[PDB]
Amino acid sequence: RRRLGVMGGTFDPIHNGHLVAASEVADRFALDEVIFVPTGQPWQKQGRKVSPAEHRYLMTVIATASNPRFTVSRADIDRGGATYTVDTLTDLRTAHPDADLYFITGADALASILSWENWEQLFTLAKFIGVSRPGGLSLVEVPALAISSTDCRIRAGQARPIWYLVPDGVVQYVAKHRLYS
Amino acid sequence: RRRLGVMGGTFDPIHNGHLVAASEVADRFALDEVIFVPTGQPWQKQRKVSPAEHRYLMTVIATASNPRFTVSRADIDRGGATYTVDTLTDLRTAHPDADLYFITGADALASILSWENWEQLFTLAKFIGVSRPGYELSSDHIAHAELPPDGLSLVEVPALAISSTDCRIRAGQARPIWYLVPDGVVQYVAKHRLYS
Amino acid sequence: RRRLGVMGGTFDPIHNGHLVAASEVADRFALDEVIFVPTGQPWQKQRKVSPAEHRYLMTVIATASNPRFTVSRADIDRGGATYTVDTLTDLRTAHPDADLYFITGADALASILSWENWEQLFTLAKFIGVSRPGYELSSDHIAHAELPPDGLSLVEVPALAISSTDCRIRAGQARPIWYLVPDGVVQYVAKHRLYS
Amino acid sequence: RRRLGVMGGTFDPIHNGHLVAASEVADRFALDEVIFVPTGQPWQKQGRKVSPAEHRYLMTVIATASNPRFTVSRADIDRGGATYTVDTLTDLRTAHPDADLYFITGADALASILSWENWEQLFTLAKFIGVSRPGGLSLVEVPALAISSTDCRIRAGQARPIWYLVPDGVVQYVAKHRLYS
Numbered sequence: 001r002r003r004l005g006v007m008g009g010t011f012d013p014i015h016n017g018h019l020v021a022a023s024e025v026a027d028r029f030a031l032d033e034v035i036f037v038p039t040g041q042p043w044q045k046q047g048r049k050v051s052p053a054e055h056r057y058l059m060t061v062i063a064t065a066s067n068p069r070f071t072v073s074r075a076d077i078d079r080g081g082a083t084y085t086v087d088t089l090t091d092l093r094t095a096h097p098d099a100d101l102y103f104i105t106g107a108d109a110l111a112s113i114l115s116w117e118n119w120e121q122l123f124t125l126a127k128f129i130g131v132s133r134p135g136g137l138s139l140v141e142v143p144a145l146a147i148s149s150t151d152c153r154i155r156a157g158q159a160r161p162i163w164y165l166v167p168d169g170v171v172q173y174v175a176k177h178r179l180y181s
Numbered sequence: 182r183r184r185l186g187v188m189g190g191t192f193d194p195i196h197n198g199h200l201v202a203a204s205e206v207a208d209r210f211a212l213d214e215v216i217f218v219p220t221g222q223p224w225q226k227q228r229k230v231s232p233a234e235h236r237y238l239m240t241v242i243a244t245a246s247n248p249r250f251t252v253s254r255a256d257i258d259r260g261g262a263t264y265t266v267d268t269l270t271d272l273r274t275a276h277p278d279a280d281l282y283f284i285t286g287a288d289a290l291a292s293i294l295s296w297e298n299w300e301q302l303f304t305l306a307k308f309i310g311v312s313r314p315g316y317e318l319s320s321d322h323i324a325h326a327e328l329p330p331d332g333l334s335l336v337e338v339p340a341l342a343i344s345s346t347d348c349r350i351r352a353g354q355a356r357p358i359w360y361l362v363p364d365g366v367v368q369y370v371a372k373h374r375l376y377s
Numbered sequence: 378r379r380r381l382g383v384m385g386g387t388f389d390p391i392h393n394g395h396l397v398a399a400s401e402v403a404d405r406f407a408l409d410e411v412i413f414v415p416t417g418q419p420w421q422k423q424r425k426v427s428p429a430e431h432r433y434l435m436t437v438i439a440t441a442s443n444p445r446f447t448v449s450r451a452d453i454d455r456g457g458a459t460y461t462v463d464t465l466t467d468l469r470t471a472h473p474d475a476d477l478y479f480i481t482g483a484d485a486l487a488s489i490l491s492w493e494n495w496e497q498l499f500t501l502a503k504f505i506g507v508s509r510p511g512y513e514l515s516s517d518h519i520a521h522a523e524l525p526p527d528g529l530s531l532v533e534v535p536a537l538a539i540s541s542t543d544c545r546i547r548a549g550q551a552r553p554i555w556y557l558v559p560d561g562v563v564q565y566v567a568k569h570r571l572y573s
Numbered sequence: 574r575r576r577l578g579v580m581g582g583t584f585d586p587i588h589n590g591h592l593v594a595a596s597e598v599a600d601r602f603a604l605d606e607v608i609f610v611p612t613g614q615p616w617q618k619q620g621r622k623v624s625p626a627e628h629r630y631l632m633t634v635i636a637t638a639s640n641p642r643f644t645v646s647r648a649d650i651d652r653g654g655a656t657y658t659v660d661t662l663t664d665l666r667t668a669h670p671d672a673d674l675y676f677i678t679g680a681d682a683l684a685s686i687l688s689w690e691n692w693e694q695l696f697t698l699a700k701f702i703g704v705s706r707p708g709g710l711s712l713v714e715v716p717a718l719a720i721s722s723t724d725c726r727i728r729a730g731q732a733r734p735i736w737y738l739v740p741d742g743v744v745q746y747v748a749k750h751r752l753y754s
C-alpha cells in the first residue's frame with residue numbers, strides 16, 4: 001500500500017522552503033511520492049492579486065521536475081471555483097484508490113481546519129501534517145520555511161533578487177512573465 | 182516592431198539540439214523572443230506520440246531558465262491535426278505588430294510547403310529551416326517552385342545531430358539521455374515513464 | 378571605484394542561505410561583485426573540517442552560475458590559521474582601487490573584533506554581519522567599544538535559518554539535503570562522502 | 574575489480590558533447606566511475622592561447638558535479654610540464670591499484686597514439702576508447718560530438734551564445750572570467 005504525500009498550497013510562488021519541507025516530510029514519513037496540488041484561486045485573495053492558475057501550476061512543475069518522487073496535479077485548478085480540501089482529497093482518493101494519503105500544508109493554514117468545510121470527512125480521508133517554521137495532525141518544524149511566498153513577491157515587485165530563495169527556472173519564469181512587477 | 186521566432190515542433194522530447202538551434206537562430210536573426218509551440222496533433226507516422234500535455238510541460242521545463250524563450254499552447258488548444266497556417270494565424274492574432282519567423286526542421290518545412298497554402302504562409306511569416314550535419318537539403322529542393330523573396334532561410338546547426346527519436350530509443354533501452362536532454366526533462370521523462 | 382563584497386566563511390558546506398545572504402547584501406549595498414573566500418584553516422572548535430580543496434570546489438560549484446559571484450583562494454593558499462586582517466590585506470593587494478565590504482555571520486564578526494587589530498580592519502574594509510531569525514545580536518554587543526563611523530552594518534537574512542551544521546548532521550544521518558544546498562553541491566558531497 | 578574510465582582532454586571548454594560521450598561509454602562498458610583529467614598545457618597550443626589550467630579544471634568540476642559517477646583529477650595539471658598519457662595512466666594506476674583502466678578521448682587524438690611517448694607501455698596500462706562524431710582500441714560514435722570546444726571558443730569570442738552547447742554554470746564561468754572574449 002503506497003504512502004502518498006499531498007502538498008497543497010497556493011504556491012505564488014513556489015519556493016525552496018516548500019521543496020525543503022516536502023522533502024523532509026517524505027523522508028520522515030517514508031512517503032513513496034509527493035503530489036503537489038496548486039490551489040484554485042480567483043483573481044483576488046487576501047487583498048492580493050493571485051497569479052493565474054496556469055502560471056502557479058507551471059512554476060510548481062518547473063520547481064519539482066528534477067525530483068523523481070515529486071509530481072504535480074491539476075485537480076484543484078481544473079475543478080472550477082473555490083478549493084475545499086475535502087474535494088482535493090476525494091479527487092485524489094479516486095485517482096489513487098489503494099494509497100494512504102498524507103495531506104501536507106503550512107501549520108498556520110491547518111490551525112483553522114475545524115472551520116474548513118466537511119472537517120469530519122477530512123480526517124477519514126487522510127492524515128494531516130502541518131509544516132512550520134521554528135519559533136490526527138502531526139507538526140514538522142522546517143527551518144527553511146523562514147522563506148515565504150509573500151517575501152518573494154515583495155522582493156520581485158521591488159526589482160530585488162529572488163535567486164536562491166526560489167528554484168532556478170522559476171526565478172526566470174517569474175521575471176519574463178512579470179508576475180509581481 | 183518586435184521580431185518573434187516561432188519554434189514549431191512535436192518535442193517528444195525537447196532536447197539540447199532544439200535549444201541550441203533556437204538560440205543560434207535568435208542571435209543570427211536578431212529575434213527579441215522565441216515562442217516554442219509544441220504540436221497539438223502532429224501528422225500520423227507509421228509511432229505513438231506522447232500526450233500533448235506531457236510534451237507541453239517538458240518544453241516549459243526546458244525553456245524556463247531562458248528569459249527570451251516562452252511556450253505557447255496555441256496548437257495544443259486547437260482541435261484536429263496541427264497545420265502551420267493555423268499556428269501562424271493564431272500567433273499573428275496574439276502579436277499583431279510583430280514580424281514572425283517560423284523555425285522548424287528542414288524536412289518538416291518541406292512538408293509544410295507541399296501541403297499548405299503559400300499565399301497565407303508567406304503573408305504571415307518568414308521561414309527558417311534548421312538542419313543537422315550531413316543532411317543535404319538544397320533550397321531548390323525544399324520547394325517545388327521559386328519562393329517569395331527573403332521568405333526562406335536555411336541554417337545548419339551541428340547540435341541537431343541530437344534527435345528526439347534517438348532519445349526515445351535510448352530511454353526505451355534504459356540507456357542514459359543525460360546531457361542530450363535538459364536536466365529536469367530527463368527526470369520528468371523517467372518518472373512519468375514516457376518511453377518505457 | 379568598484380564596490381566588492383568579500384564573503385568569508387568555512388562553507389562546510391556552502392548552502393542556499395549563504396547564497397541568499399550574499400545576493401541580498403550585494404543588492405542592498407550596491408556591490409558590483411561578491412568574492413567568496415573559503416577559509417584555509419579555520420579556528421579549531423571542540424569538529425573536523427573538510428579538506429580546504431573540497432570546500433573550495435563546493436563554493437565554485439555553488440557560485441558558478443552567478444555572473445556577479447567569484448571565488449578566491451586567498452585564504453586557502455596562505456599557511457597557518459586564517460585571520461581576517463590577512464584576508465583583507467590580500468584582497469586589497471588584488472583590488473587596490475576597490476571599496477571592500479567584508480560579509481560574514483554575526484558571531485564570527487564578533488570573534489574577529491575581539492582578536493584582530495581594529496586599526497588594520499577598519500582601514501581595509503567596512504563590515505557587514507548577517508544573522509538568522511531569532512538570533513538577537515545588538516551592534517552594542519558585537520564589540521566591546523564604539524566602532525568607527527559606518528564601519529559595521531547588521532543585516533537579518535531569513536534564509537540563514539539554514540545552517541551548515543544542520544546540513545552536515547542530516548548528511549551523516551542519510552537524510553536529504555536537497556533544496557537546502559545547491560544541486561551539484563549535494564551530489565558532490567555524496568560522491569566524495571564528505572559527511573559519512 | 575572496478576572498471577574506471579579516464580576521460581582525458583584539454584577541455585577548453587568542457588562541453589555537453591564531452592559529457593554525452595563519457596556517459597555513453599560508461600554505460601556501454603559498464604564503468605563504475607569516469608575520472609576526467611584535464612591536460613596540462615602551456616600558454617600556447619596549436620596557434621592557440623590555452624586557458625590557464627585552473628580555469629579548465631574548475632570548468633570540468635562545474636560540468637561534472639551533478640553526476641554521481643563522474644569525478645575530476647588534477648594529476649596532469651599538477652605534474653608540471655607537458656602531459657604524456659603514459660604518465661597520466663601511471664599516476665592513476667598508483668592511485669587505483671585494483672582497477673582496470675579505460676582511457677577515453679577523441680578518436681582524432683588517438684589516431685596518432687603510435688607517435689605518443691612509450692606507446693608500448695600505454696597498451697599494458699589501459700584499454701583505449703576513441704569517441705568520434707559520425708561520418709586494443711575501441712571506437713564509439715557519439716552524435717553529440719558534433720559540438721566542439723573550438724566552435725564554443727569561436728562563438729564566445731564573437732559574443733554569440735553558447736547556452737545549451739556548454740553546461741549551465743560553465744557558460745557563466747566562461748563569461749565572467751572572459752576566457753575567450
Ligand SMILES: NC(=O)c1ccc[n+]([C@@H]2O[C@H](COP(=O)([O-])OP(=O)(O)OC[C@H]3O[C@@H](n4cnc5c(N)ncnc54)[C@H](OP(=O)(O)O)[C@@H]3O)[C@@H](O)[C@H]2O)c1
Nearest residue numbers: 008009010039083084085105106108109116117148149150
Ligand atoms: N476550506 C478549506 O478546505 C481550506 C481552507 C484554507 C486552506 N485550505 C488548503 O490549505 C492549503 C494551503 O492554502 P494556501 O496556500 O492558500 O494558504 P495561505 O493562507 O496562502 O498560507 C498560510 C500559510 O501556509 C503556508 N503554506 C501554504 N502552503 C504551504 C505548503 N504546502 N507548505 C508549506 N507552507 C505552506 C504559507 O506560506 P507560503 O506563502 O510561503 O506558502 C503561509 O505561511 C491548500 O491546499 C488549501 O486548499 C483549505
Ligand SMILES: NC(=O)c1ccc[n+]([C@@H]2O[C@H](COP(=O)([O-])OP(=O)(O)OC[C@H]3O[C@@H](n4cnc5c(N)ncnc54)[C@H](OP(=O)(O)O)[C@@H]3O)[C@@H](O)[C@H]2O)c1
Nearest residue numbers: 189190191220223224263265285286289292293344345346
Ligand atoms: N508533416 C509534418 O510533420 C508537418 C506538416 C505541417 C506542419 N508541420 C509543423 O512542422 C513542425 C515540426 O513538426 P514535427 O516536429 O511533428 O515534425 P517531425 O516530422 O517529427 O520532424 C521532422 C524533422 O524536423 C526536426 N524538427 C522538428 N521540429 C524542430 C525544431 N523546432 N527545431 C529543430 N528540428 C526540428 C525533427 O528532429 P527532432 O525529432 O529531433 O525534433 C526531424 O528531424 C511543427 O510546428 C508542425 O506543426 C509538420
Ligand SMILES: NC(=O)c1ccc[n+]([C@@H]2O[C@H](COP(=O)([O-])OP(=O)(O)OC[C@H]3O[C@@H](n4cnc5c(N)ncnc54)[C@H](OP(=O)(O)O)[C@@H]3O)[C@@H](O)[C@H]2O)c1
Nearest residue numbers: 385386387416419420459461481482485488489540541542
Ligand atoms: N573564530 C572564528 O571563527 C573567526 C575568527 C577570525 C576570523 N574569522 C573569519 O570569519 C569568517 C567566518 O568563519 P567560519 O565560517 O569559520 O565561522 P563559524 O564559527 O564556523 O561560523 C559562525 C557563524 O557564522 C555563520 N557564517 C559563517 N560564514 C558566513 C557567511 N559568509 N555568511 C553567512 N553566515 C556565515 C555560520 O553559519 P554556517 O555554519 O551556516 O556558515 C555560523 O552561524 C571567515 O572568513 C573566517 O576567516 C573567523
Ligand SMILES: NC(=O)c1ccc[n+]([C@@H]2O[C@H](COP(=O)([O-])OP(=O)(O)OC[C@H]3O[C@@H](n4cnc5c(N)ncnc54)[C@H](OP(=O)(O)O)[C@@H]3O)[C@@H](O)[C@H]2O)c1
Nearest residue numbers: 581582583612656657658678679681682689690721722723
Ligand atoms: N604524447 C601523448 O601522450 C599525447 C599526445 C596527444 C594527446 N594525448 C592525450 O589525448 C587526450 C586529448 O588531448 P587534447 O584534448 O589536448 O586533444 P586535441 O588535439 O585538443 O583534440 C583532438 C580532438 O579530440 C577531441 N577531444 C579531446 N578530448 C576529448 C574527450 N575526452 N572526449 C571527446 N573528444 C575529445 C577534440 O574535440 P574537443 O575540442 O571538442 O575536445 C578534437 O576533436 C589528452 O588526455 C592528452 O593527454 C596524449
Ligand SMILES: O=C1OCc2cccc3cccc1c23
Nearest residue numbers: 066067068069368555556560
Ligand atoms: O537530479 C536530481 O537533481 C535535483 C533533485 C532534487 C531533489 C531530489 C533529487 C533526487 C534525485 C536526483 C535529483 C534530485
Ligand SMILES: O=C1OCc2cccc3cccc1c23
Nearest residue numbers: 172246247248249736737741
Ligand atoms: O539566467 C539564465 O540562466 C539559464 C539560461 C539559459 C539559456 C539562456 C539564458 C540567457 C540569459 C540568462 C539565463 C539563461
Ligand SMILES: O=C1OCc2cccc3cccc1c23
Nearest residue numbers: 163164168442443444445745
Ligand atoms: O544566468 C544566470 O543563472 C543562474 C543565476 C543564479 C544567481 C544569480 C544570477 C544572476 C544573473 C544570471 C544568472 C544567475
Ligand SMILES: O=C1OCc2cccc3cccc1c23
Nearest residue numbers: 359360364564639640641642
Ligand atoms: O542529479 C542529477 O542531475 C544531473 C545528472 C547528470 C548525469 C547523471 C546523473 C545521474 C543521477 C543524478 C543526476 C545526474
